[PDB]
């Protein structure tokens, strides 16, 4: 629990939304609303290409945002449930650790600076390979391995 | 904290409403709806002169009501944030004891009988003199010192 915020929709916990920099980002495919009315009233823009939902952060909450970085070194990273291996341009997780519902939770570095948002994972490598959105040459881009299932 | 009840509008509390005698009392300037369904459905009457919204207490809340009294001798009184001086026909409080949100707290005497409801206040330097509606010959009357701000 550093920046993760619960999104709840019609009885079901349906993911997490994150305010980072000037954006509130949430996966477009998870329907419903973040359970604080101040956020819930903003103009959200949908992109099907990235399955991304983006919004402008309100002013009085700007200082609550997580830091970010363009730098993604190879190594181990942290998320809510433990270590995340990054190598080969792939974020990976222990096979079977995966949990449908957690899509939208951030991945962060050794200084707690978020580098990517997880969308899901693919079960036929060696470890679970994550499909994620992240910024390369300051451009947001989605990297999705073939045969990934929605979480 | 014995007989004090909220009212909330778009996630933010917007002051308080109070059941007093056989009365449901709320300032009219408090925007929004009480987030408890028994209160929101009564017949409310507006008075613009007094900024008052009025309702009859339902039977199921009758045994929760605060005692009151019409007689207000000079002295000190109580509210949630401490002492309130009444003397000279003027009620005042220490500057900083009140802030946006405290409108709706009842003011009560040493026998726990509510004598007045706060609508707002005028800072006069070291202390703040409240604008309040209260009773004279059993009739509600608004007393407002010059330069009063809503709380």
UniProtKB/Swiss-Prot annotation, chains A, B:
It comes from the Viruses. A motif (Nuclear export signal) lies at residues 34-44. It is found in: Virion; Host cytoplasm; Host cell membrane; Host nucleus. Residues 3-151 form the Peptidase S3 domain. The active site is at 29 (charge relay system), 51 (charge relay system), 103 (charge relay system). Residues 45-50 are annotated as: Interaction with spike glycoprotein E2. Residues 73-83, 109-113 are annotated as: Dimerization of the capsid protein. Disulfide bonds join 3-18. The record marks 77, 110 as: Involved in dimerization of the capsid protein. Homodimer. Homomultimer. Interacts with host karyopherin KPNA4; this interaction allows the nuclear import of the viral capsid protein. Interacts with spike glycoprotein E2. Interacts with host IRAK1; the interaction leads to inhibition of IRAK1-dependent signaling. Forms an icosahedral capsid with a T=4 symmetry composed of 240 copies of the capsid protein surrounded by a lipid membrane through which penetrate 80 spikes composed of trimers of E1-E2 heterodimers. The capsid protein binds to the viral RNA genome at a site adjacent to a ribosome binding site for viral genome translation following genome release. Possesses a protease activity that results in its autocatalytic cleavage from the nascent structural protein. The N-terminus contains a nuclear localization signal and a CRM1-mediated nuclear export signal. The C-terminus functions as a protease during translation to cleave itself from the translating structural polyprotein. This is Capsid protein. It comes from Chikungunya virus (strain 37997) (CHIKV). The chain holds residues 111 to 261 of 1248 of the full protein.
């Amino acid at each position: 629990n550093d920046c993760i915020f619960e999104v709840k929709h019609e009885g079901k916990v349906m993911g997490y939304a994150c305010l980072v920099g000037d954006k509130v980002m949430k996966p477009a495919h998870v329907k419903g609303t973040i359970d604080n009315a101040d956020l819930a009233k903003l103009a959200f823009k949908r992109s099907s290409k990235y399955d991304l939902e983006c919004a402008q952060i309100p002013v009085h909450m700007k200082s609550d945002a997580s830091k970010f970085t363009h730098e993604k070194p190879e190594g181990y990273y942290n998320w809510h449930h433990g270590a995340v291996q990054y190598s080969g341009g792939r974020f990976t997780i222990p096979t079977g650790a995966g949990k449908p519902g957690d899509s939208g939770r951030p991945i962060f570095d050794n200084k707690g600076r978020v580098v990517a948002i997880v969308l899901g994972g693919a079960n036929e490598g060696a470890r679970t390979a994550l499909s994620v959105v992240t910024w390369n040459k300051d451009i947001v881009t989605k990297i999705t391995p073939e045969g990934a299932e929605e979480w």
